[PDB]
Design an enzyme around this catalytic site. Structure first.
Site, PDB file in Angstrom:
ATOM      1  CB  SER A 189       0.739 -74.902  15.526  1.00  0.00           C
ATOM      2  OG  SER A 189      -0.159 -74.016  16.269  1.00  0.00           O
ATOM      3  CE  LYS A 244      -0.315 -76.775  19.694  1.00  0.00           C
ATOM      4  NZ  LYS A 244      -0.481 -75.592  18.771  1.00  0.00           N
TER       5      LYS A 244
END
Length: 198
Positions: free
Chosen positions: A121, A158
């Site tokens: 990611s 996140k």
């Protein structure tokens, strides 16, 4: 078969960061890093910077690296990546970031006693950090397939890491947690440059 989407309540803490040094970076890209134990989950920013800044890592993570898609090293990361960077990079946990007028930033680099960073990611951050001459004001998340972004789990947790210091989460997540959705690497570099205005 394909995924079931399910809801899960998470107990989130911020990493206590240790061994704090302000360092001045003229370039680098932020991305979110999440981890889970019994007990608690964590969400933090790290900064990917091109070249080797091993001297700035904890010793406990210095020997770990993943290969990029053209065989470079990303010091601090764990297994090749899809992304092709034409440079080594190092990633570092950071507690905060103070921009200067010229696109550079003084970045509070910390030691968190977390393991090497797993998963891909970070790919969007890698990319921008391997190409940009400035520190975009945003954090990025998204795996890469060629120049097409792929969406990552944990968007909402996140975003916490990004918002904690006043930054958008930019990229693509399975739960729509990003502030701005970006499906290509070109649009992410566009966004990075845009981020520099006011």
């Amino acid at each position: 078969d394909l995924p079931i989407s399910l809801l899960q309540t998470l107990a989130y803490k911020q990493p206590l960061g240790r061994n704090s040094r302000i360092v001045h970076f003229t370039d680098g890209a932020l991305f979110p890093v999440v981890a889970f134990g019994d007990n608690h989950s964590t969400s933090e920013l790290y900064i990917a910077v091109r070249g080797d800044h091993r001297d700035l890592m904890s010793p406990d993570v210095r020997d770990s690296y993943a290969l990029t898609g053209d065989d470079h090293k990303v010091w601090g990361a764990t297994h090749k990546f899809n992304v092709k960077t034409r440079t080594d990079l190092t990633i570092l946990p950071v507690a905060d970031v103070f921009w200067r007028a010229d696109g550079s930033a003084d970045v509070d680099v910390v030691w968190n006693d977390m393991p090497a960073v797993a998963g891909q990611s970070s790919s969007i951050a890698l990319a921008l950090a391997s190409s940009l001459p400035f520190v975009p004001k945003a954090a990025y998340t998204g795996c890469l397939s060629g120049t097409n972004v792929q969406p990552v789990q944990f968007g909402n947790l996140k975003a916490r890491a990004a918002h904690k210091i006043g930054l958008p989460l930019v990229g693509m997540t399975q739960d729509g947690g990003e502030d701005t959705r970006i499906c290509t690497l070109d649009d992410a570099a566009d966004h990075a440059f845009d981020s520099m205005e006011s």
